[PDB]
Every structure is written in structure tokens, then in C-alpha cells.
Design a protein around this ligand. Sequence first.
Ligand SMILES: OC[C@H]1O[C@@H](O[C@H]2[C@H](O)[C@@H](O)[C@H](O)O[C@@H]2CO)[C@H](O)[C@@H](O)[C@H]1O
Length: 461
Amino acid sequence: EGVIVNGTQFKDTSGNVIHAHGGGMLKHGDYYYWYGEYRDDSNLFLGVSCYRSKDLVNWEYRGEVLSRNSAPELNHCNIERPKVMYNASTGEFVMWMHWENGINYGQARAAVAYSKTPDGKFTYIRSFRPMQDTGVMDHGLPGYMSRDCNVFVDTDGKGYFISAANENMDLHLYELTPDYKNIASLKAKLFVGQQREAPCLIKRNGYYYLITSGCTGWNPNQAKYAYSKDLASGWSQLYNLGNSTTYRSQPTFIIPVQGSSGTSYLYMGDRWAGAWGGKVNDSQYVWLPLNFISDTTLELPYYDSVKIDASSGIISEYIPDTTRYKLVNKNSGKVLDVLDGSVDNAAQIVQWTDNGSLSQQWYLVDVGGGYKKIVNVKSGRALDVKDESKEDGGVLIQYTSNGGYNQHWKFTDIGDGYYKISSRHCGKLIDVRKWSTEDGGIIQQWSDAGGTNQHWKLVLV
Ligand SMILES: OC[C@H]1O[C@@H](O[C@H]2[C@H](O)[C@@H](O)[C@H](O)O[C@@H]2CO)[C@H](O)[C@@H](O)[C@H]1O
């Protein structure tokens, strides 16, 4: 039962709430290590917890790899978004983070630590504003400002540290020295004046991807991403990821989960309790699979429950009720299907002859109220009203799950095993365009006209 429930606080094997907010993860040896920070009673840096696991669902407490006792300046300060990276050369784990006074946010500086072991007590080094010796001034103080940060290890073995500089208006990508413990140079300035936060740097197939968020404090916002063949330059524009609130969370880290079947990229986020006036320690977590439609097209769907099999390297949606269904039209006798049985995103939904194919099989996931999710079997995509249309003739397609109301459907029994499937967005029924009775008939959205082309029978398979 390797299933995770988003919007909650995961519990470790001990039965206690996991506290690794704004944390990250590292895959070394046979274990996945989850680092993170958490405040105390005075909302100050208490410690950087570390959790270990092989299945990525059951986490074991390993203590604080970093504490407020590890250093004199760690006593009364703010530490958030701590990330850990491994060095093949040295053989030691280097840890980066964001440091503040605890009184204010004027000291936008980065902090560094390291240890010979992953779950061992780290030794704090120093806190500083990158390029301090260069003499450069960034808003009153020497050295580039450094708040929200993250680490990345390239294929060539070069370490990288990224953080928000120039009052969180610009992103600075710093190249680290071979030891990962110092900054070697300023690789490039990314997305200037665009004010992107909570950056996550990853790589797939010679393509670098940068998942960022907006700057609106606790309030969740529209997450975005970009790609490039080179870190120095060639970066694309910003493309929206997830919904308008990133499913009520903020991106924190993204790691490749490799297994026998292949590689599935895992997304980590934080549902900050600050949104509803709660303390940082009451923040929940949101884990979702990061899917790659193409080298240039990314997808971040929202599953209320996610199943993970680290061994095989598969991250997909968890369906509570695996019961398969066929939706047969009363008028045509055809069943609900996907055009050309495609698994592509935004694929047109059409009616087709009952041929017992996968494309014609659908799950039904309850999502509160009298509404449900109609999910295709051949493709985990959900039945969706294109562009959240509220007009007659509005085409229906299969799209990535995004918790949108244009993906919620209510079944209204009309008798004899037939239903009127209305959308939650406007209330219009699933309709076969122009009363079509042939294969390829466009499935659309239309007002309840009492027509038989709007009536569907639910059949178990
Ligand atoms: O493309 C399908 C997709 O559309 C979303 O609606 C978007 C729409 O894509 C976009 O063109 C428009 O500018 O904004 C709409 C929402 O704000 C749906 O949300 C999604 O479920 C899919 O249907």
C-alpha cells in the first residue's frame, strides 16, 4: 500500500508527524534521504530534520543533521529551504540553505554545511552573501542577496547553487567549486525582473528545466517552468505549470525516481499553514508526478492520492475503485471513446463502436458532493470540458487532472440504467454532436434538451 495522501502531514514509522518543510531529497546508495527545516515556539530555526526510506512512503526518523546548537549564529536565526547534494570526488555530503537574522530579512545570505555521512551530524561552516569579496553591492550590503535557494548536480560532476537575488527580482545561478562548499563563479542571471521564487533545477535529456513559483508570501500562486540546452544561455520563456495555485502548494524540490521500469520525476511542495493563519510547523505536504509530454512540454497533474513504487520507478494516480466502465449512448448505441485511441493530452473525445478496447474503459473517482472524475484507462487523463467552456457545442477532451470543475461530473438517474451526466462548471450534459450515430461522433457539451443523444448507460466490464 505505497499510497500517499496529499494535503496532509505525512507520518513517520514512529507514528509522528514529519517536519521537513521547504526541504529536499537525495538518492544515495539504497536509500532516499528527505531533509527539511522546522521552527519552534518563537518561530525560529530549531533544527534540520532528516528522514530515510527505500519505498518513498514509509519514512524513518534519523534526527537533526543540523541544529540551532551546531553553531553560534544558528542559535537565533531563520533557516529555510535546506538542500543536500553529494560529491563523488570528496565523498562528503554538502548542504546549502537560506539564512536570516530572526529579527528581519536584511541579511539575505546563504549558509553551508557538510558531513561524511548522509544522516550524520553535519558541521556548520559559514553564512555569506555570494561574491562578497568582489566588492559588488546589492541593496545596501556587500554581496548578492540570497533568499529562496536550491542545489543541482550536473552530469559532468559540476555543482550548482541557485537563489533569488536583487530583492528576489532576479535569479542567480552560481557554479560551485569542485568541493561544492564554495562558489566558483556566477554562471548566469535567469529571468531578470520577473521575480521568480522557490526555484527547482533539474535535468532530463540534455535539457535543463527550471520550475519556479511566484512571490506572494504564504499565498499559493501560479507555478511556471522553462527549459534550455545550456545553463549559461538558451533559456526559454515561462510556461504555466499546474493550476492558478499550484494545487494549493509551493514547489520545493524535484528528484528523478529511477527504477526497473524507467524514471519518474517526483514533485515536492509545501502547503504552508500561513495561508490560513497557522504556524509553520502545521504545514502540510503535496507530492505529485512530473510528467514529460515532450522535451519542451511538461505536465503537473493533481491526484488527491498518489501511488508510488520506487523499485519499478513508477509514480501514478491511486484509484480507490478500480471498477472499469463503458458509457453507452442511448441513441447511437456507441460508447464513449478517445479519438484514434490516443493517449496524447487534450485528445478529442468521440463515440465509437463497442470493441472492448482500453480507450473505451473509464474509472470513476469520487471527488466530494455528488460529482465524480471520469478517468480513461489507457491514459490516466480525465474527461474534461475544453477551456472550461460554458457554451453549447463545447468540445469534450481528455486532459491532465487539475482539480478543475470542468472535470467533475454528476450522474443523474433517469431510469432503466441510463443517466444524465452534467458538468459541475455550468451543468450542461455530455452530448453526442448532431445526434450522430456513426463512428467518430464528436462528444461535446450541451444543455439538457431531453434528447436520447444525451442519455448514457453505465456498464461494468
Ligand atoms: O486546454 C485544455 C485545458 O484548458 C483549461 O482552461 C484554460 C484554457 O486552456 C486556456 O486557453 C485559457 O486561457 O484559460 C483556461 C482556464 O483558466 C482547463 O482548465 C483545463 O481543464 C483544460 O480543459
